[PDB]
């Protein structure tokens, strides 16, 4: 019965709250206070990447830490060589409303999707020497917001239809469907071991998913508005979420609650992208105001600022070796910072 | 080697310039409307599980790409941001009076959104033959939904569109004035609403859009050429 089940759900919510409060013997701030501040993190723009006609919506580094793909809503994916700023590829998209792009960890494929509700997989290593649409994954009933390769044959995508999906690229059919979110799923972060992924979905809640079982292991709340970005902590035991309430938050999977909140009274704009540094000491967050902030992920202090974009900072990315961070903005420029 | 990489980059950049020409010369429009609005029919008047439809048409050698939202959920606060650089939003609203307050709220949200606060709205008050039939019939009263209509009187400077009974003119101009009030009460001259009385059968809708885009582009040219 509806009312009976509602009361049961509320009682279980109280039980979970009490359990995670009992686990909350101490706070992260009370434990990290004895560590030395990180200091002022001063970072400079080593490169600026020009060539996109419209706003950049997403970017993703290659595993080699040199090549990076960016997607613009003028209808192009550009694979750049960040060292020289040479454009390695320029893929014209069949739908110009792209909202996400991904780089296969092997470098052989890229992926992109958007308001067309389709994840297009592009083969970069064709024998003919020209890029082609390898596959078109269809089945989502809403815009794709994020996508991320598990492998050359598996990709996990999040959609505005409130569900995520694990696909088999060879057959082009959803191997698994992840359901349980109520709002649009905005971003997903794949775990370092690739056996889990987290997703933030415009309902002020994030969820942890087991790829193989296809079920929601944990649900984390604490945000006041939509979650636009989610990133895994490098060890894979925590993740950071940025939201429209103008705060970032850190969640630990095993403690199952929120550890730290990164916010300031002078920030009244939403977070569009988040990323952790190589060691996880610095958390980099792009904001609706045109500059990014670098936070001491342990002490929750704003260690630095990356200013230099004339419009919204839409995407963020740290290389696998941690040598540089790329920021892409709605002014259509990607800037590499170091 | 590095020389070959630079050569490939330059070859790519040539194509990028070639595409920049086309991208800059084309005008992109976002077509918004409710289910009852006849926007689906307006698209068919542009005779030159997918989540977006594009119809590309041409007026006096100018190319317009008009985008109609396809299979999307009713929550639009996120994908709407994709359209912060279109030249215009064609907002189609049915005149049936009741969904009018819903359309007013949609227009208000579009107008006051941070990312749509510089986009001009071409407002198609569609289905005006239906509005005339409904007003003349007398069975449906606008006052039952908009009490301020009980004391609204037609402005003396309003164009009459000859052949309209004064009641039809009063009703249609009150409906127009609602949206115009929403548009002028907030923001500033950074964007403009262009109201039109239209029917889905009208063959001049395309022309209207053209006439409005010329103005919209004009307003940006005044800035781009140091005139304001």
């Amino acid at each position, epitope marked *: 019965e509806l009312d009976q089940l*509602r009361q049961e759900a509320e009682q279980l*919510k109280n039980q979970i709250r009490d359990a995670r409060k009992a686990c909350a013997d101490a706070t992260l701030s009370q434990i990290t206070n004895n560590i030395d501040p990180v200091g002022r993190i001063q970072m400079r723009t080593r490169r600026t990447l020009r060539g996109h006609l419209a706003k950049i919506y997403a970017m993703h580094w290659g595993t080699d830490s040199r090549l990076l793909v960016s997607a613009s809503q003028d209808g192009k994916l550009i694979i750049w060589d960040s060292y020289t700023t040479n454009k390695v590829h320029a893929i014209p998209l069949r739908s110009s409303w792209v909202m996400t792009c991904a780089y296969a960890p092997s470098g052989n494929y890229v992926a992109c999707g958007g308001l067309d509700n389709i994840c297009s997989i592009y083969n970069l290593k064709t024998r003919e020497g020209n890029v082609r649409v390898s596959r078109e994954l269809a089945g989502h009933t809403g815009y794709l917001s994020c996508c991320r390769f598990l492998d050359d044959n598996q990709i996990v995508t999040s959609s505005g239809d409130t569900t995520c999906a694990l696909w088999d690229i060879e057959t082009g059919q959803q191997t698994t469907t992840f359901t349980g979110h*109520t*709002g649009d799923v905005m971003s997903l972060s794949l775990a370092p071991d690739t056996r889990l992924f987290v997703s933030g979905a*415009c*309902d*002020a*809640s994030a969820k942890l998913w087991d790829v193989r079982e296809g079920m929601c292991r944990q649900t984390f*709340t*604490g945000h*006041e*508005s*939509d979650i636009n970005a989610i990133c895994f902590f490098p060890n894979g035991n925590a993740f950071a979420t940025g939201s*429209d*309430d*103008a705060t970032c938050r850190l969640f630990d999977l095993r403690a199952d609650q929120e550890l730290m909140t990164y916010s300031h009274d002078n920030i*009244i704009c*939403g977070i569009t992208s988040v990323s952790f540094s190589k060691s996880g000491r610095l958390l980099l967050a792009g904001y609706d105001d045109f500059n990014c902030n670098v936070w001491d992920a342990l002490k929750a202090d704003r260690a630095g600022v990356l200013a230099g974009h004339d419009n919204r900072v839409s995407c963020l990315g740290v290389t696998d070796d941690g040598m540089a961070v790329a920021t892409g903005s709605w002014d259509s420029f990607l800037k590499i910072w170091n | 080697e590095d020389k070959a990489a630079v050569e490939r980059s330059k070859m790519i950049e040539k194509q990028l310039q070639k595409d920049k020409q086309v991208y800059r010369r084309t005008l992109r429009l976002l077509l918004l409307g409710a289910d009852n609005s006849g926007k689906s029919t307006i698209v068919k008047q542009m005779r030159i599980t997918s989540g977006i439809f594009e119809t590309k048409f041409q007026v006096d050698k100018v190319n317009f790409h008009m985008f109609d939202v396809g299979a999307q*959920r*009713d*929550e*639009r*606060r996120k994908w709407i941001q994709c359209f912060n650089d279109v030249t215009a939003i064609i907002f189609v609203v049915d005149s049936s009076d009741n969904r009018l*307050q*819903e359309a007013l*709220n949609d227009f*208000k*949200s*579009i107008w*006051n*959104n*941070r990312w749509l606060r510089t986009i001009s709205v071409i407002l198609f008050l569609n289905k005006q033959d239906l509005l005339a039939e409904k007003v003349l019939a007398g069975k449906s009263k606008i006052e*039952d*939904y*908009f*009490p*301020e209509f009980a004391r609204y009187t037609t402005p003396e400077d309003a164009t009459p569109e000859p052949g309209e009974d004064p009641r039809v003119t009063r009703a249609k101009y009150f409906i127009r004035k609602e949206f115009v009030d929403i548009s002028t009460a*907030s923001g500033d001259g950074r964007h403009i609403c262009y109201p039109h009385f239209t029917c889905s059968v009208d063959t001049e809708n395309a022309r209207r859009i053209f006439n409005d885009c010329k103005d919209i582009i004009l307003q940006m040219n005044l800035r781009e050429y140091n005139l304001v």
Partner: nanobody
Amino acid sequence: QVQLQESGGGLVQPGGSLRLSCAASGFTFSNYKMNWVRQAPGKGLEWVSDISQSGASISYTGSVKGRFTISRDNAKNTLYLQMNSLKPEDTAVYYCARCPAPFTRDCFDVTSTTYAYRGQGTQVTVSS
């Protein structure tokens, strides 16, 4: 967690009055515009009224203007709708919704497909 709990409202005779209250938890109540929405039997969701962060700006739908009044108390994180001269057509489930993001002027909160930041509603019935 973000939760909105509405109380008050029920069976009332035509021409009566009812004060609906909504307690908000999980977010800074003063940073968001608040809205009253309703769903009548056999119809879709309909926006009733809205009140800004400080209450300085208010708006009502025409069918209720002059009868209902919206108010907010930020110290108590509560939203009130005082409804006078109830009409039979006001029979509906009343939901309290809030703007999706803080410090904004626009709202997108009448959606049927489970808008996240509104409550479960309270039934208000007007009958003889």
